[PDB]
Amino acid sequence: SGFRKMAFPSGKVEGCMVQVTCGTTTLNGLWLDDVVYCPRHVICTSEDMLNPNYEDLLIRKSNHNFLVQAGNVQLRVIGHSMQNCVLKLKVDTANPKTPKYKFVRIQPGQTFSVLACYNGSPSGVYQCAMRPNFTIKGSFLNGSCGSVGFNIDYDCVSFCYMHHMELPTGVHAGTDLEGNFYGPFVDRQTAQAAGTDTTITVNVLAWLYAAVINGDRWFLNRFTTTLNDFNLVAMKYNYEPLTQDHVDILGPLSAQTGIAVLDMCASLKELLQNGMNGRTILGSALLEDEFTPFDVVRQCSG
Amino acid sequence: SGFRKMAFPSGKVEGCMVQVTCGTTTLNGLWLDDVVYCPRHVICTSEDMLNPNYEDLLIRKSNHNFLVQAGNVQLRVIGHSMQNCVLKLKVDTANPKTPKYKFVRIQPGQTFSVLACYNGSPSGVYQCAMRPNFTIKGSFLNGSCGSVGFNIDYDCVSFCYMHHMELPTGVHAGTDLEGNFYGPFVDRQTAQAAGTDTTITVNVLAWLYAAVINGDRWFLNRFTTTLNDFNLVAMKYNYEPLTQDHVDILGPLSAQTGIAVLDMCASLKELLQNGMNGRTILGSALLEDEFTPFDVVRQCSG
Ligand SMILES: *[C@H](O)[C@H](C[C@@H]1CCNC1=O)NC(=O)[C@H](CC(C)C)NC(=O)OCc1cc(F)c(F)cc1F
Numbered sequence: 346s347g348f349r350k351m352a353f354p355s356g357k358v359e360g361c362m363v364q365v366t367c368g369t370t371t372l373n374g375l376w377l378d379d380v381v382y383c384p385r386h387v388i389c390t391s392e393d394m395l396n397p398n399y400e401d402l403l404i405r406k407s408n409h410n411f412l413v414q415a416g417n418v419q420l421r422v423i424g425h426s427m428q429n430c431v432l433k434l435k436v437d438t439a440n441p442k443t444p445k446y447k448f449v450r451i452q453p454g455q456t457f458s459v460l461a462c463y464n465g466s467p468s469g470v471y472q473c474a475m476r477p478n479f480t481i482k483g484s485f486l487n488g489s490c491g492s493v494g495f496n497i498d499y500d501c502v503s504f505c506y507m508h509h510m511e512l513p514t515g516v517h518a519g520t521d522l523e524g525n526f527y528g529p530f531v532d533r534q535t536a537q538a539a540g541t542d543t544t545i546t547v548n549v550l551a552w553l554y555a556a557v558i559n560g561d562r563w564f565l566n567r568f569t570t571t572l573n574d575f576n577l578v579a580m581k582y583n584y585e586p587l588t589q590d591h592v593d594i595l596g597p598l599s600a601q602t603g604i605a606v607l608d609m610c611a612s613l614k615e616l617l618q619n620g621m622n623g624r625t626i627l628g629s630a631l632l633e634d635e636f637t638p639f640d641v642v643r644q645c646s647g
Numbered sequence: 648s649g650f651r652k653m654a655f656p657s658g659k660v661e662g663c664m665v666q667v668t669c670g671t672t673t674l675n676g677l678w679l680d681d682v683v684y685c686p687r688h689v690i691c692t693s694e695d696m697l698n699p700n701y702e703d704l705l706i707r708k709s710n711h712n713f714l715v716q717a718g719n720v721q722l723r724v725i726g727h728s729m730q731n732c733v734l735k736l737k738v739d740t741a742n743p744k745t746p747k748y749k750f751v752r753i754q755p756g757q758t759f760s761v762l763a764c765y766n767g768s769p770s771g772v773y774q775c776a777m778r779p780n781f782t783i784k785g786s787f788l789n790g791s792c793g794s795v796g797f798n799i800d801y802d803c804v805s806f807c808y809m810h811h812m813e814l815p816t817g818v819h820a821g822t823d824l825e826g827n828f829y830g831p832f833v834d835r836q837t838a839q840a841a842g843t844d845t846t847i848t849v850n851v852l853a854w855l856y857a858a859v860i861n862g863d864r865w866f867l868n869r870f871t872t873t874l875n876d877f878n879l880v881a882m883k884y885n886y887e888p889l890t891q892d893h894v895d896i897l898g899p900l901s902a903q904t905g906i907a908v909l910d911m912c913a914s915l916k917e918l919l920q921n922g923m924n925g926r927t928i929l930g931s932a933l934l935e936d937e938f939t940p941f942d943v944v945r946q947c948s949g
């Protein structure tokens with residue numbers, strides 16, 4: 346009973362967070378086996394940030410320019426390299442707490458847990474969706490770079506995000522763990538604009554199924570719609586098109602509730618056209634689009 | 648930048664969760680030093696649940712009736728006792744991962760992180776407030792009992808909640824770690840009603856300060872109010888009275904934003920009387936009351 350935005354338990358990742366210092370710049374790194382991963386802008390200084398030439402900056406560095414601190418213990422850096430926008434620091438000690446892990450590059454609309462960290466020390470955990478415009482709506486202050494996002498599946502941690510920057514609109518941008526930015530962003534100290542965002546339709550439908558599973562039924566109707574006709578209304582309200590692949594993904598939730606997917610689409614259409622009229626769904630006065638179908642199944646039951 | 652509902656990192660608690668089995672009943676326990684804490688209704692059966700006599704049920708049990716599983720390892724139960732609504736199981740092994748910890752009984756309006764668990768295995772983490780009617784709005788399924796709520800302060804875990812039951816309205820009730828229920832509830836398989844709930848005024852004000860710190864200023868006004876006059880309007884909208892102690896607690900946030908507390912009260916009064924007119928605050932169309940002043944300061948900065 347109840348439905349909450351829920352993060353994965355963070356213990357397996359907490360044991361991987363370290364502090365990386367280069368000069369007067371300190372941020373977080375991810376320590377897996379004998380490698381530490383961190384954002385390459387740790388090697389920048391005050392005037393570098395505007396438009397840094399990272400290959401030049403890195404060639405001017407040596408191993409002893411990097412300070413890695415794991416709790417109170419200093420780790421010796423014995424090699425360094427740059428891969429896209431991430432720095433990889435080889436250290437003399439393999440992390441004894443390295444979980445089973447993978448690196449994954451996620452698609453827009455997928456969610457993950459963020460372990461916000463400062464100075465190598467975890468601060469809090471929360472759930473984020475990769476927006477269609479490749480930003481996330483996080484909570485990050487100075488010193489948070491190198492915090493990572495992840496999913497957990499049977500004690501295997503899939504890392505999918507490393508934090509690098511904030512945009513002027515207060516949203517956030519970063520890379521996969523191979524250092525490739527999500528979206529068009531670059532790691533420079535400049536105001537960068539994201540594309541216009543859209544609402545993740547398949548997630549809104551998943552969340553309406555969660556509401557029914559939890560006993561919220563007031564928005565259902567007897568009407569039905571075609572997929573093409575639903576997507577015409579979706580365009581008008583800046584919702585992503587719903588594909589047949591999305592319909593199939595909602596299959597299990599549709600089977601558990603007995604509500605056909607295109608039936609739930611007819612409910613969403615009426616909610617988009619008439620509003621909620623002062624009612625709420627799962628406690629929300631706005632339609633929620635940061636729960637995937639997987640998130641709903643993981644948390645709901647019978 | 649950004650403001651998110653954020654849980655504490657859960658690693659220190661994950662290493663304390665075990666499975667407790669009595670007969671065909673399985674739930675979660677908390678393993679600290681050589682004691683396992685769990686809800687006493689683990690010793691109930693099908694017909695016991697309606698109105699169990701727990702002292703009778705426990706006198707009919709012996710140590711070997713309790714199965715404790717820590718991961719794959721079985722722990723030997725070498726003693727047992729009941730304290731209020733919690734069972735305490737002495738085991739032959741002290742938990743090597745026992746954090747520094749305290750047991751605390753919290754006041755309504757305070758928040759904590761919940762580590763939802765099933766079969767001794769952590770499932771997810773989320774933040775909850777103890778409501779004025781001593782329920783929490785959680786997400787708990789069959790098998791979740793014994794999941795705990797906690798706060799963390801400089802690597803000391805303060806445990807404040809253990810989960811025992813759901814109410815017919817879909818909210819949740821439980822005990823402190825000494826086994827005393829929050830609120831009037833009892834651990835019987837019966838429909839129990841909570842008192843009428845009210846909104847946590849000091850938390851709503853804290854969250855309005857978070858919005859200003861984050862650049863949301865549209866709800867401010869030039870007007871001001873007295874505390875007595877604010878509390879007359881609070882009663883009309885089912886808000887808790889604001890005390891001078893609450894005003895003092897909001898001191899730091901007021902000093903950082905330059906907005907006097909009674910000035911922010913005048914904003915809240917106008918929001919209560921006129922609504923938001925289709926605008927949002929920190930992404931919310933409803934006023935949020937599950938962030939304490941401490942939560943805001945912990946997460947916000949300059
Ligand atoms: C790394 O810790 C930090 C995270 C930021 C800091 C505040 N909240 C965050 O998420 N990342 C940065 O500070 C990056 C460093 C660059 C070298 C990549 N810069 C950044 O986020 O700048 C944002 C920015 C910059 C300019 F110039 C603007 F005009 C607006 C703006 F939002």
Ligand SMILES: *[C@H](O)[C@H](C[C@@H]1CCNC1=O)NC(=O)[C@H](CC(C)C)NC(=O)OCc1cc(F)c(F)cc1F
Nearest residue numbers: 787789790791792811812813814815834836837838
């Ligand atoms: C323990 O795991 C479980 C947690 C519940 C199960 C579903 N969601 C939860 O949070 N606790 C219980 O099942 C307790 C056991 C009692 C012996 C304390 N019962 C319970 O929650 O019942 C709720 C209930 C009971 C009756 F009879 C009703 F009519 C309504 C109702 F909500």
